[PDB]
Amino acid sequence: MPRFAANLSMMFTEVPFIERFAAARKAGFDAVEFLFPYNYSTLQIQKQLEQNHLTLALFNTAPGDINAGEWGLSALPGREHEAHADIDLALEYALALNCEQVHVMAGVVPAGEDAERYRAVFIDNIRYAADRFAPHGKRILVEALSPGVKPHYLFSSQYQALAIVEEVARDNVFIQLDTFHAQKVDGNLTHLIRDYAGKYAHVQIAGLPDRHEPDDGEINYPWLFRLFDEVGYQGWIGCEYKPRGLTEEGLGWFDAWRGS
């Protein structure tokens, strides 16, 4: 262990998206995750998942218009019906692709706008997602994003994500503990992993501080893995990093930790 999932939106980008499933399997991954599958039919993706015997661990609700500065519609006042549409489409994909969880994106708060109003809207949209997903035994994830990656995003600290989930008050809503953002904003990863065990349903990793391979940087990942084992984490660890160079050329860390 741990159980690693390759993030196809960041890894194996040398080839077209649809070809990354085979690339991940060739490297030895049993699961994959990515951001947005919407430009492809559920049939297209399902075929690649089955062909390569892969588990789809996670994906996101749509970002909206990225070039207009959007990164989620669920926290945007007046866009609630579009957010619900994004949530419903994600459910359609999650059902067809046998994916247990979806990260419902919040959104960027325009300068001058009241963040509280956006937060209230986000909480109601997460409750909507939670109630739509519960009957199918699926869950909803909330991911804090560091400012270096997404300026002015609704929330950047794991503690803000945790408080939001606590207020959402749903048994199938959890945070997405991306250690890259956590180390950039909060630190004390042991406290988050150990004392909030049960509150995060997914984990992601990347090397600090440049977000490349996880076998170097200020965080000693092998030690973190021991912690995850201790607390009995049973989910997947998404490898969401930008390879320093060619994806394959930087997979030494994987062979080591998976072969051990």
Give the annotated binding-site residues.
143, 178, 204, 240
Smallest distance from the beta carbon of 168 to Mg ion, in angstroms?
19
Smallest distance from the beta carbon of 86 to Mg ion, in angstroms?
18
Smallest distance from the beta carbon of 112 to Mg ion, in angstroms?
26
Token pair in block for residue 194: 């150990």
Sole binder of Mg ion in the list 33, 86, 100, 186 (CB under 5 A):
186
Is residue 204 within the footprint of Mg ion (CB under 5 A)? yes
* Catalytic-labelled residue, pool 33, 100, 143, 213: 143
Smallest distance from the beta carbon of 205 to Mg ion, in angstroms?
9
Distance from first CA to last CA of the chain, Å, rounded?
A: 8
Q: Which stretch binds Mg ion (CB under 5 A): 51-59, 73-81, 202-210, 247-255?
A: 202-210
Helix axes 80-96, 115-133, angle to 10 degrees: 30
- 14 noted as active-site residue: no
Count of chain residues binding Mg ion (CB under 5 A): 4
- 113 noted as active-site residue: no
Sole binder of Mg ion in the list 86, 100, 178, 213 (CB under 5 A):
178
* C-beta of residue 230 within 8 angstroms of C-beta of residue 222: no
Q: What is d(CA 198, CA 175) in angstroms, rounded to the nearest whole number?
A: 10
Q: What is d(CA 73, CA 125) in angstroms, rounded to the nearest whole number?
A: 9
Q: Which stretch binds Mg ion (CB under 5 A): 19-27, 102-110, 171-179, 191-199?
A: 171-179
* Catalytic-labelled residue, pool 213, 240, 248, 249: 240
Neighbours of 120 (CB within 10 A): 14
Nearer to Mg ion, 100 or 186 (CB): 186
Q: What is d(CA 248, CA 257) in angstroms, rounded to the nearest whole number?
A: 16
User: Do you find a cis peptide bond into 214, omega within 30 degrees of 0?
Assistant: no
DSSP type of residue 108: B
Nearer to Mg ion, 101 or 204 (CB): 204
Instruction: For residue 135, give the amino acid letter.
Output: P
Token pair in block for residue 18: 């649809």
- Partners of 141 in the β-ladder: 103, 174
Smallest distance from the beta carbon of 240 to Mg ion, in angstroms?
5
Token pair in block for residue 168: 């959402």
Q: Which stretch binds Mg ion (CB under 5 A): 10-18, 44-52, 56-64, 183-191?
A: 183-191
Annotated binding site for Mg(2+): 143, 178, 204, 240
Catalytic residues: 143, 240
Residues lying near Mg ion in the complex (CB under 5 A) are found at: 178, 186, 204, 240
